[PDB]
Amino acid sequence: MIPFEALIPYAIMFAGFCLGGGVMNSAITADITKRARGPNQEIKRNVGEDEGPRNYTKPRYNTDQWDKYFAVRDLRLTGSLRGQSDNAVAEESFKTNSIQPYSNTRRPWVLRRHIIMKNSPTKWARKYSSRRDEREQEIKDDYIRGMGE
Amino acid sequence: MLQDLFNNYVILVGILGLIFLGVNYFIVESPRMDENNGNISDYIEKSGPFECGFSSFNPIPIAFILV
Amino acid sequence: WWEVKSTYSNKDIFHPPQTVLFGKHIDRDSGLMYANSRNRFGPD
Amino acid sequence: SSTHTNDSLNSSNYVDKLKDTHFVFENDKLPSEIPDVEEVGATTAPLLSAAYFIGAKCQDYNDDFMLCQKEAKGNGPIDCLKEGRRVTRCASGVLKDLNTHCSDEFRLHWQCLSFSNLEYKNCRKAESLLNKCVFEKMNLVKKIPGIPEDRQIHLKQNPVLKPVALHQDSEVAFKKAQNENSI
Amino acid sequence: APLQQVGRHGGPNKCFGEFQRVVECMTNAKHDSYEPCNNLKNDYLECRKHKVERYKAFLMQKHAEELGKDPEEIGAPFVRKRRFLTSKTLGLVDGDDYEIGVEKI
Amino acid sequence: MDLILLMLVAVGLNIIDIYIMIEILIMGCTVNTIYSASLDNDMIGLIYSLIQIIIAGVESAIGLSILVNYNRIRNSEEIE
Amino acid sequence: FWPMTFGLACCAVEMMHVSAPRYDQDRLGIIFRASPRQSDIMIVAGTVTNKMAPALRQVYDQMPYPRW
Amino acid sequence: MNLEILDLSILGFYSLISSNSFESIAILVATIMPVITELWYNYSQLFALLYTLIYVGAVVILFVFILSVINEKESGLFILILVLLLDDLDDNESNDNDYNNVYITDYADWFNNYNESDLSVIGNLLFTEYALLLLIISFILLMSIIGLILIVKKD
Amino acid sequence: AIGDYPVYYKQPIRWLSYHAHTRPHVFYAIAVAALGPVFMMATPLRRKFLYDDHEPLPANGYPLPNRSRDKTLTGYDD
Amino acid sequence: MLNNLFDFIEYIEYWLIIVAFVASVLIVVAYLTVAERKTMGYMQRRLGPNAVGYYGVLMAVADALKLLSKEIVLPHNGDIIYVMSGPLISLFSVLLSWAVIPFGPGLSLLDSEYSIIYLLASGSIGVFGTVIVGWMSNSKYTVLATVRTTAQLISYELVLTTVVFIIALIVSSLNINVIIESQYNIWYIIPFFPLCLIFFISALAETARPPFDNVEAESELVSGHMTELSASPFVIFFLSEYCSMVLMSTLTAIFFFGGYLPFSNTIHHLILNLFDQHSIYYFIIEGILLSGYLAIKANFFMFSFVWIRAAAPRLRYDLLILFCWYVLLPIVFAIVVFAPGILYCFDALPVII
Ligand SMILES: CCCCCCCCCCCCCCCCCC(=O)OC[C@H](COP(=O)(O)OCCN)OC(=O)CCCCCCCCCCCCCCCCC
């Protein structure tokens, strides 16, 4: 004698997983596909009359460092991180849009602002002793001191 | 691997924390509305421990410590 | 008297420079959903 | 591997804010002393689809391009610029061929890769058609060095790990070839 | 001898080549002293921190200030927000300036 | 500012507060190593950091064990 | 409707039988709670002696409003 | 608005005023969290998670475990803000100005076709190259198990 | 000895039985754990009877041919 | 307008996905509480809640709204820090631990090769949240459930951590998605059945569910830490215990029952052939299916959380700490030296493809 009233909450919990999964599978796939249609918004939205059936792109997982180099390389070709293109020759804009990110190399904020973490025998000498910095500054000075030869 | 979708999730959960606290503070009826006998502060009878009714006032085993 | 050379004493190993002088901030006048990107090649 | 670096795009815009990353362009093209080459325009999926045919056709130049890097002794980028254009031209030759000989067989395969997380294990039905077509019209074959011919993975009739979801265009195109070709 | 400066992928990293050339010179048998290897030692330190090269960037920043050279016309164009690496900026033929998708790959 | 030894004002007046300051102090050493190792793309620095985290854990356990037995030694009448 | 398990004497036996399978107070959303903090209904089921009286007042005062 | 500064100023404010051991253990958790979060972004996501798994999950809840055992018993606003402001002014940990004002990049390359996580390389070297370091560690762990029991066990 | 605790060096067989009855939480944890290293020792048996080890992976960078650069290499020129 | 409104959606689309994700979890958690009483009601010949909303559908709504509108009891009026902080840590940790669970291939908010570490690290923050609740209280019952709470969670954390690492050792990957896909040909319940019993036993202790109930034991320590909790601090802490139940039931599905993989590849193939892959209707059906397989597997374990509660008397605490150390841990270390041995013997050491 199967109680259906007892299984009502489970059919609602089953719908809870399906609701979240159904949205994620379709929304992310649609967004990835749409941005992989062309380099402007008047191309992404509209579908041409002479365009064929639409081939959706599923989201990508388990990537490595080559997929970060492939993603930027695809960005410079199509305007999307997961664009599609198989032209044997790239655009002439491909040779003048390489993105090289420049970022600072300063120590973490906690390492140099914490009331306790910043106190140390060697961190004071880096911060309050000129012995190290005067020695290294000699090498920088002697770079421009050797351009005469 | 992009994680801007993950960041929005963490931010939303952070916002969800403020909502849970304050929704109680804005929906409970005013102390005057119910019985007016006092706030939680002055009503020290209500703001106290539970000792099953009778008012009263850790040398734990070393085995628990070694666990 | 200034010379244009790499800061590396050795010469037979290629050491491409890893610094740059920042110029235009292209996305400076941007908004939301739509960058007002400035002209990269030359002035506005 | 999703480790943060100073050389490409990172995980989130909060990494960029901490590092104060500037994405810097350089408008300057190459000087005229270096003869120009036409860069390959294929994206990730087409390259992974045609990777073994670039290996079959540009094997001599790829080996020679690398041997120039080994024997340049640290001056590799500057002393292998001429040998690095043969590889770019050779690889452009293969992608141009696939577009003019096997356009639909090629596109079907790398649409499958773009549909199945860019994994070769999920696209064997489309891949088998492409390999069979390429062989008859360009003589290129796919070979995985270091193993016997009988034990190559892409020829495995009953693989242990199979795709969870089927590519409709692959299954439809496959059974059509089961009539067009398996006479 | 123990491996030092191993990259995040198991191979030699950026500055391993310089360090190896130092070890070859220091442990060499045809050297009477360590003077010939003094330049190689600087290169290994240079490869890691770029202190001399950062200094050169400081003068070129400071020299342009004393001459009035406009930073935007001597420097290189850059973008601070990754969402605004738009196809207009990348130079694509019919590219919009609408932001790009950096949510999920 | 810290040359006047300000960090002494920031450490509480219990033996357990000293133990925490030792951990926060060592935490700075490990964070410094992780910083250098990632910039250099050197995994040997990350091996060092992994050892420092593991060794800094063993130091905590021994210190707490001494502190725990120190506490029960006073409360050792146990004549009930 | 979460009451507080304040059964004192034979009246509490009938209180437990309300929660038994035949009547099943839980089917109406009634869960007996063992603490004033989590309870809003006090059910006095049994004899209130003089010795128990001050404890009953203390337990009553510890219930957050609204209470019945 | 590098908000990581404001988290530590609050943290640096409560470290000067903590009285009991409840707040002292709070300074520990309030310090790891900026350490973990500033490692998750920027430098190393692997060691942000190792810190959570090993510090918070293992050594932090041991502190609160023994605080409940040990005991629970028992300044001026001008001087604190004056000290915190004075502490706030000079925050340059190093005095190489060019090293702190000039940005750098790296160039990627495709020579590494066997891409694997850092924890793959660390295990590759710890279990092969420095197997002595790994084996001494299990020896240090072994001494602690003996060391804990001899210190604490009564009989 | 109807119930005496066995001595290991005189009664090896009965010593394990005592521990396989009174300490099932120790005897079978040791029995399971030893089955790993035991199986490692039988690896050479599998090599001669079942199948050889696979070929090692190409995880050392690009495979560089062991020769000198080709001199007659032409085509795809500027 | 129609062109300046579409881009508005495309600028808000990835916030609607997250809300649909959060709503997806909360619906399961909200109706898990009903399903616990509805199921345990029918095993006791009762009926369980069937009077609050048609057939009791609005039972979680009433309980949550009743407590959200109770008077919060603070020791002094401005002591909201002490009451809330405990549950808040517990709720955030288990809500952040949902960020790595995939509902399909790649459909997880956070995807990184350190997902397994992130999942174990997040859970250990919640453990810190639990013990803090009592440790800021003078009530004897509430402060009782800290030293016993601390060790119970501490002791069964080693067992839960090691089991996860054995599965990660069989696939040589700390990524959640890779583990699920590695189970295509076989589900890890067949080779590692003992680990599943050990995983499920450990999972009960970590959420403090019966028969490992000694923390919040009504007959022993009343509500445990919650005997001083009322109104919102009670719900947030109660919600955390049921987010963990849903999570740890989903984790057993992922590690031993294949995650989102189908029960039958044929039935999966036949169903999807009725939809065209060139229309978005195909991908909704697949997402509903793939989450459906996970939901059915996860539901079976949320059922078993309740099922074991209705069949096993509570286990004594002193005999509970000695169980994980003197029985479970030797077995778990025995296997961790057993699985590498079998794999090496047959030249089957795993690699992340
Ligand atoms: C999701 C938010 C979770 C945190 C909620 C609480 C936020 C309130 C601010 C405290 C946290 C700031 C971080 C610095 C620690 C400061 C701890 C302290 O000094 O005591 C704070 C608290 C209230 O007491 P108070 O009046 O402020 O001080 C005098 C009391 N004799 O004294 C108490 O111990 C009361 C109980 C508080 C227990 C908090 C446990 C420590 C915090 C860990 C969780 C947050 C982790 C840190 C994240 C932010 C880091 C900057």
Coordinates of N, CA and C and ligand atoms in Angstrom, one line a residue, chain H residues 6-8 10-11 14-15 17-20 22-27 29-31 33-34, chain J residues 81-86 88-89 92 128 132 136, ligand 1:
Chain H
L6 N 40.4 47.7 5.2 CA 39.5 48.0 6.2 C 39.2 46.8 7.1
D7 N 39.4 45.6 6.6 CA 39.2 44.4 7.4 C 40.3 44.3 8.5
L8 N 41.5 44.7 8.2 CA 42.6 44.6 9.1 C 42.6 45.8 10.1
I10 N 39.8 47.1 11.4 CA 38.9 46.6 12.4 C 39.6 45.6 13.2
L11 N 40.4 44.7 12.6 CA 41.1 43.6 13.3 C 42.2 44.3 14.2
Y14 N 40.5 45.7 17.4 CA 40.1 44.8 18.4 C 41.3 44.1 19.0
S15 N 42.5 44.1 18.4 CA 43.6 43.4 19.0 C 44.2 44.2 20.2
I17 N 42.3 46.0 22.3 CA 41.4 46.1 23.4 C 40.8 44.8 23.9
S18 N 41.3 43.7 23.3 CA 40.8 42.4 23.8 C 41.2 42.1 25.2
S19 N 40.2 41.6 26.0 CA 40.4 41.4 27.4 C 40.4 39.9 27.8
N20 N 39.4 39.2 27.5 CA 39.3 37.8 27.8 C 39.9 36.9 26.8
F22 N 38.1 34.8 25.0 CA 37.2 34.7 23.8 C 37.6 35.6 22.7
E23 N 37.9 36.8 23.0 CA 38.3 37.8 22.0 C 39.7 37.4 21.4
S24 N 40.6 36.8 22.3 CA 41.9 36.4 21.8 C 41.8 35.3 20.7
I25 N 40.9 34.4 20.9 CA 40.7 33.3 19.9 C 40.0 34.0 18.7
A26 N 39.3 35.0 18.9 CA 38.6 35.7 17.8 C 39.6 36.4 16.9
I27 N 40.7 36.9 17.4 CA 41.8 37.5 16.6 C 42.4 36.5 15.7
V29 N 41.0 33.8 14.3 CA 40.1 33.5 13.1 C 40.0 34.8 12.3
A30 N 40.0 35.9 12.9 CA 39.9 37.2 12.1 C 41.2 37.5 11.4
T31 N 42.2 36.8 11.6 CA 43.5 36.9 10.9 C 43.7 35.9 9.8
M33 N 41.2 34.5 8.1 CA 40.3 34.8 7.0 C 40.8 35.9 6.0
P34 N 41.4 37.0 6.4 CA 42.1 37.8 5.5 C 43.3 37.1 4.8
Chain J
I81 N 25.0 40.1 18.5 CA 26.3 39.5 18.0 C 26.4 38.1 18.5
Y82 N 26.1 37.9 19.8 CA 26.3 36.6 20.4 C 25.4 35.5 19.8
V83 N 24.1 35.9 19.7 CA 23.1 34.9 19.2 C 23.3 34.5 17.8
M84 N 23.5 35.5 16.9 CA 23.5 35.3 15.5 C 24.8 34.7 14.9
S85 N 25.9 35.1 15.5 CA 27.2 34.8 14.9 C 27.4 33.3 14.8
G86 N 27.0 32.5 15.8 CA 27.1 31.0 15.7 C 26.4 30.5 14.5
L88 N 25.2 32.0 11.9 CA 25.6 32.7 10.6 C 26.8 32.0 10.0
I89 N 27.8 31.6 10.8 CA 29.0 30.9 10.3 C 28.5 29.6 9.7
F92 N 26.6 30.1 6.3 CA 27.4 30.5 5.1 C 28.3 29.4 4.6
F128 N 33.4 25.0 13.0 CA 33.7 26.1 13.9 C 32.5 26.9 14.2
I132 N 30.8 27.4 18.3 CA 30.8 28.8 18.9 C 29.4 29.1 19.5
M136 N 29.6 30.8 23.6 CA 29.2 32.1 24.1 C 27.8 31.9 24.7
Ligands
LIG1 C1 29.4 36.4 9.3 C2 29.9 37.3 10.4 C3 30.5 36.5 11.5 C4 31.0 37.5 12.6 C5 29.8 38.1 13.3 C6 30.3 39.0 14.4 C7 30.8 40.3 13.9 C8 31.1 41.3 15.0 C9 32.5 41.8 14.9 C10 33.5 40.8 15.5 C11 34.4 40.2 14.3 C12 35.4 41.3 14.0 C13 36.8 40.6 13.7 C14 37.7 41.0 14.9 C15 37.3 40.1 16.1 C16 36.8 41.0 17.2 C17 36.3 40.1 18.3 C18 36.0 41.0 19.6 O1 36.8 41.8 19.9 O2 34.8 40.8 20.3 C19 33.7 41.0 19.4 C20 32.5 40.4 20.1 C21 31.6 41.5 20.6 O3 32.2 42.1 21.7 P1 32.6 43.7 21.6 O4 31.5 44.5 22.3 O5 32.7 44.1 20.2 O6 34.0 43.9 22.4 C22 34.1 44.1 23.8 C23 33.3 42.9 24.4 N1 33.9 42.7 25.8 O7 32.9 39.6 21.1 C24 32.4 38.3 21.0 O8 33.2 37.4 21.1 C25 30.9 38.0 20.8 C26 30.7 36.8 19.8 C27 31.5 37.1 18.5 C28 32.1 35.8 18.0 C29 32.8 36.0 16.7 C30 33.8 35.0 16.4 C31 35.1 35.6 15.9 C32 34.7 36.1 14.4 C33 34.8 34.9 13.5 C34 33.8 35.0 12.4 C35 34.2 36.1 11.4 C36 35.6 35.9 10.9 C37 36.3 37.2 10.7 C38 35.7 37.8 9.5 C39 36.1 39.3 9.5 C40 37.6 39.5 9.6 C41 37.9 41.0 9.7

